């Protein structure tokens, strides 16, 4: 599909069996998901943006379906105000910017 930018580009994702809403963020290197009990092993990480840094848990090789398109990669879990799909997964679904 084509997604315009008049409103926030929020889409449905499927991760760890759950459906959630997430923002497609070309300005995010990584994918950051709100809380979420999730699997069994992780590494600590800190990530920053406007503001400052938050602490997150890095999980690897997590399947994430984005608007029906399958992806699999690293997901960071922590107290983000909005679920964010970043470039690591946008590239896997063939997402481009066009103007």
Ligand X SMILES: CCCC[C@@H](CN[C@@H](CCCC)C(=O)N[C@@H](CCC(N)=O)C(=O)N[C@@H](CCCNC(N)=[NH2+])C(N)=O)NC(=O)[C@@H](NC(=O)[C@@H](NC(C)=O)[C@@H](C)O)[C@@H](C)CC
d(CA 50, CA 37): 26
In angstroms, the first-to-last Cα distance of the chain is 15
Q: Which does 40 bind (CB under 5 to 8 A by kind): ligand X, a copy of itself, none?
A: none
CB of 22 to ligand X, least distance (A): 8
Total number of residues binding ligand X (CB under 6 A)?
17
Q: Which does 2 bind (CB under 5 to 8 A by kind): ligand X, a copy of itself, none?
A: a copy of itself
Phi, psi of 40 (to 5 degrees): -135, -20
CB of 1 to ligand X, least distance (A): 18
């Amino acid at each position: 599909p084509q997604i315009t930018l008049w409103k926030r580009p929020l889409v449905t994702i499927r991760i760890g069996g759950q459906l959630k809403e997430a923002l497609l963020d070309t300005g995010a290197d990584d994918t950051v998901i709100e809380e979420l009990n999730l699997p069994g092993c992780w590494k600590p990480k800190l990530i920053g943006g406007i503001x400052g840094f938050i602490k997150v848990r890095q999980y690897d090789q997590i399947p994430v379906e984005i608007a029906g398109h399958k992806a699999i990669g690293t997901v960071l879990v922590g107290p983000t105000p909005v679920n964010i799909i970043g470039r690591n997964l946008l590239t896997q679904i063939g997402a481009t910017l066009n103007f």
